[PDB]
């Protein structure tokens, strides 16, 4: 019995690509989707395969360290019995010198490049051939696959469609930008494989990383970490300072292809520059390429305050933010979390997600991975205290948007992240999320004299069992009477402020004459504003308070008997409150019923800081009963200070 001579192996690129929805990717290499049969044809030289004498065994391996235990290596006989869910090969057609086979892969096989080998034994003597290579991808058409989507129209949109829209602008002005995902363009798949092959998990344990690629949760997670630079292997370098001269402007890009190519072409070095939508767009491209159903989503925020300043000048809040959602089951979580999963590749690990959009709507923030981050992107919590009252100067999570299935229209998916405001479902979610509460008010607890230095306090009360780590900005500005804020006269900022369960703190800011003296207004008024930020759950506390800097009191002493029409002497004094000297000091005293003339006494010498100043005036009561003496004090730096004194006569 002559040994079979394999002439050639035909990969049936055409029939395979068509059937696996990978036609564009079947350049000259075979690409297929897992859990679905595919075809190949052996051409023999001489006699054909005779099942009765020939034994053919197939071998597949993927990655730098394949093993059967890890599912990255498989061996399987060419036979008639087909075990569903396994690697198998069976004959389906046999002609003169051709043998057509059908191969199937598990629906949870690791995706990646595979080398296919064939062992052909005729009784005693045997031979081995490398038939070729194929690439194996996730399969949204296969019901047993974790990324299965039951709607064909949605598989066209979220996997096969190479152009779409990315939403920008603002809630009020929703702007769309066209984008060429180009997931099937020449070279792109190879680049995506490289991207996996350079991720830190592959460096740490190659064989394990290749095996874990059976999971779209794992692959998604890895893609979310590799899109931003961080460790120079990453794809894009972010920049928001509006200065992109040594690179490409984030607003300029119209697709993912050039970015991916540039990255690879420079030895896997960051591409400049990106912003959120660009990170999201690339991720979407990579994920679609590998066959995980994905869409780019945009969320809008808005504003009308100390909050604004705090942001102007490490998570923060933009006019809009973009990320991706990807479709898959979650066998790693409690049942019922299959579906759309948010992944945020915009800059515990550099990765972010996947987290079920559903766990975010429900406030179930322990669900892996990174629920709080995504929750904080669509929920903020702003409260004022005037002395507690909800503040709406800040609104997060508006008009969440993504492209419509098979139409150039926008779909609003806000409902998928957030129950209606006021709804009882919304309240249950806030409750699951953040397990009376915490408050903040400006204290002074003292007199504040024009001229002095003194402290004000951000007084913070934590009446929950929870410990909070917060940022606190506490600052003061002069405030005129018409309410306009003048220049700042004291600031304090704590990046780390710790509040133990059921405790309180009075955080001080010193207010200094030197800083306020000259920036003061006609009012003698200073506004203290505090902002307490708790970044995890995205909660904000605002406390405001105006303060009145009082003028010194004019001491007025009457000396003598109050008897009807007897003589009396008035002693009038003021203690300089300034740490500097008063010049051109003059008191003015009058009062019908006590004196008939207006007494004005000049002060020759400058009144030194902290020093008192006395003058006296003889008075002549004339009628029984109450008379008020009235006094004005004038000077170069302290003006129109007043006082009075009741006097009763007998």
């Amino acid at each position: 019995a002559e040994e079979l001579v394999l002439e050639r192996c035909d990969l049936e690129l055409e029939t395979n690509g068509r059937d696996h929805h990978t036609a564009d990717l079947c350049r000259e290499k075979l690409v297929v989707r897992r859990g679905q049969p595919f075809w190949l044809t052996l051409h023999f030289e001489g006699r054909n395969y005779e099942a009765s004498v020939d034994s053919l065994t197939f071998s597949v391996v993927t990655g730098p360290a394949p093993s059967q235990e890890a599912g990255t290596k498989a061996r399987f006989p060419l036979r008639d019995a087909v075990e569903e869910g396994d690697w198998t090969a069976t004959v389906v057609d046999q002609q003169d010198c051709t043998l057509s086979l059908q191969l199937t892969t598990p629906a949870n096989a690791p995706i990646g490049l595979y080398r296919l080998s064939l062992e052909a034994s005729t009784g005693y003597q045997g031979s081995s051939f490398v038939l070729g290579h194929f690439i194996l991808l996730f399969n949204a058409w296969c019901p047993a696959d974790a990324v299965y989507l039951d709607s064909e129209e949605e598989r066209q949109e979220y996997v096969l469609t190479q152009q779409g829209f990315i939403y920008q602008g603002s809630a009020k002005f929703i702007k769309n930008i066209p984008w060429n995902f180009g997931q099937f363009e020449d070279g792109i798949l190879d680049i995506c494989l490289i991207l996996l092959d350079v991720n830190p998990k592959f460096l740490k344990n190659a064989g394990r990383d290749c095996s874990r690629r059976s999971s779209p949760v794992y692959v998604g997670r890895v893609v979310s970490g590799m899109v931003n630079c961080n460790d120079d292997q990453g794809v894009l370098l972010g920049r928001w300072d509006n200065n992109y001269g040594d690179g490409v402007s984030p607003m300029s890009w119209i697709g993912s292809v050039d970015i991916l190519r540039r990255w690879k072409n420079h030895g896997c070095q960051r591409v400049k520059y990106g912003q959120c939508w660009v990170f999201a767009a690339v991720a979407c491209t990579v994920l679609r390429c590998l066959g995980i159903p994905t869409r780019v989503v945009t969320n809008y925020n808005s504003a009308h305050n100390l909050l604004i300043e705090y942001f102007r000048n490490s998570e923060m809040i933009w006019n809009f933010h973009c990320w991706v959602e990807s479709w898959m089951t979650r066998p790693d979580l409690q049942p019922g979390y299959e579906g759309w999963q948010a992944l945020d590749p915009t800059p515990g690990t550099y990765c972010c997600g996947p987290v079920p959009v559903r766990a975010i709507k429900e406030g179930d923030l322990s669900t892996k991975y990174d629920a709080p981050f995504v929750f904080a992107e669509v929920n903020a919590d702003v409260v004022d205290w005037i002395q507690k009252s909800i503040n709406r100067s800040l609104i997060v999570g508006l008009k969440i948007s993504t492209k419509s299935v098979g139409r150039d229209e926008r779909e609003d998916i806000t409902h998928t992240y957030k129950y209606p405001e006021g709804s009882s479902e919304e309240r249950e979610a806030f409750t699951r999320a953040n397990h009376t509460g915490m408050a903040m008010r400006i204290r002074v607890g003292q007199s504040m004299n024009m001229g002095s230095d003194f402290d004000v306090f951000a007084h913070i009360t934590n009446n929950t069992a929870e410990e909070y780590v917060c940022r606190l900005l506490l600052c003061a500005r002069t405030v005129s009477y018409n309410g306009i804020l003048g220049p700042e006269c004291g600031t304090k900022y704590l990046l780390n402020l710790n509040l133990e369960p059921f405790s309180e703190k009075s955080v001080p800011l010193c207010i200094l004459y030197e800083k306020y003296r000259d920036c003061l207004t006609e009012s003698n008024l200073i506004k203290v504003r505090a902002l307490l930020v708790e970044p995890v759950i995205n909660s904000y506390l605002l406390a405001e308070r105006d303060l009145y800097l009082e003028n010194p009191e004019i001491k007025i002493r009457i000396l003598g008997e109050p008897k009807q029409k007897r003589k009396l002497v008035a002693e009038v004094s003021l203690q300089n409150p300034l740490p500097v000297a008063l010049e051109g000091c003059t008191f003015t005293v009058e009062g019908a019923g006590l004196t008939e003339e207006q007494k004005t006494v000049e002060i020759p010498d400058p009144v030194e800081a902290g020093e008192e100043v006395k003058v006296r005036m003889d008075l002549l009561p004339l009628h029984m009963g109450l008379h008020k003496l009235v006094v004005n004090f004038e000077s170069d730096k302290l003006k129109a200070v007043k006082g009075f004194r009741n006097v009763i006569i007998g």
Binding site: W240, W318, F320
Partner: peptide, 4 residues
């Protein structure tokens, strides 16, 4: 994107 700009800080809100």
């Amino acid at each position: 994107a700009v800080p809100l």
